[PDB]
Symmetry: C2
């Protein structure tokens, strides 16, 4: 009768996560220094991704344990829900990222994290370029494997990682679907968002640690089950959230 892929997929996943945990500590720390420095300087933390990568922006925005100084840049035209494949077309268009930075009034006091697995398209690369132009620090989350292997589709000829102050490597294999289904040529089990979400939280957790060590009391959304969560959350929403 039928066998199970679960043990195998767990092992596949756990290796990637191990390697990530083992190799990204220094990056996480340097990224957290960038973010904490910005916060302490009156700055914000902008987060952006295109396609599926946008979920890492969502992940650290407006939730329990969430730093209220985080603003997700979430253009729905680059998401998944308006029409299938729309975001694939738009990712190639020059001038979008620059408009977005303008709309959100990102300044040189700020930090931005840009998530892209391949880091090869116009939108994410432009976002890094225009951010540098503004003078904001850039964190890139990416698949260093995938991205090193691909050719830029941005006019610079460069990739996202090549414009970052700090790179966070999600460890995803080239393709982001690297688990081969037994007795077939079918590949699945993408790791970029699971591991990407882990890393995004680790960054925030590290940032908060750095702030606390320094005697900064950062605005962080309390989970409903803590006493007085709501009144506190309403207070800090009002004082802090920029969308």
């Amino acid at each position: 009768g039928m066998t199970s892929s679960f043990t195998d997929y767990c092992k596949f996943f756990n290796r990637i996560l191990s390697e990530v945990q083992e190799t990204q500590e220094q990056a996480i720390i340097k990224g957290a220094h960038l973010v904490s420095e910005a916060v302490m300087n009156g700055g914000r933390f902008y987060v952006f991704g295109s396609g599926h990568s946008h979920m890492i922006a969502e992940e650290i925005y407006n939730r329990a344990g969430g730093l209220a100084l985080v603003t997700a840049i979430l253009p729905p035209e680059l998401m998944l829900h308006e029409r299938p494949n729309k975001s694939t077309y738009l990712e190639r268009i020059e001038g979008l990222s620059k408009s977005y930075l303008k709309l959100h009034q990102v300044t040189n006091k700020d930090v931005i994290m840009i998530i892209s697995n391949s880091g090869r398209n116009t939108v994410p690369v432009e976002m890094a370029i225009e951010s540098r132009n503004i003078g904001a620090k850039v964190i890139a989350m990416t698949s260093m494997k995938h991205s090193q292997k691909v050719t830029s589709r941005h006019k610079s000829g460069k990739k996202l990682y090549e414009y970052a102050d700090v790179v966070l490597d999600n460890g995803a294999p080239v393709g982001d679907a690297g688990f081969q289904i037994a007795n077939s040529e079918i590949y699945s089990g993408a790791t970029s968002d699971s591991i990407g979400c882990f890393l995004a939280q680790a960054l925030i957790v590290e940032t908060l640690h750095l702030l606390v060590q320094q005697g900064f009391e950062p605005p962080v959304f309390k989970s409903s089950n803590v006493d007085g969560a709501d009144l506190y959350n309403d207070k800090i929403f009002n004082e802090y959230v920029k969308w």
Copy 2:
């Protein structure tokens, strides 16, 4: 802990992930049977979550390694980007899920996965009730710890997991921000989405594995780096993607 939280956060996280992997295998297998049987019987796999939970639907929808018979139900009004807190309010409203189900013409041949940490609010509970009433199979992804501790806000006085054919436990602690920022009262490091994504992926992998074993050749999107990826993808999109 003195300077960095990263090692501690990894341990914290790996603990939860280990527990999830140690315990959810039978539930993964059961869910994959539901989905694989539906697929072979002319059905689809719908996926839905409110608030941050929506990203789990996104995760297995329209992507490399993705099963083309997955349709995410993604009402923007219950996402994060329109305005802050809108999803929180709307999740408590009667009648939305019944509309969504109609709009997506969900039928008795299908399966639906509903993701909610607490599983206590009207939207996900109403969705679960109506989906079984139609005749669909229901998979719930929830935090069993959180869900069991809280009272239901739905008029039936029951919770999401109580209405599902299979439950996936994301292992998240009550409140979903359980990691203490060393030597403060600040808590962070939400795990429901990182672990949630891994679970969604494990389910699909297992579903594909069951299908291949039964000689069914499923439509799975190929990644960019694969030969013929784009034609094949257009083909299966055209044949299968409903939205």
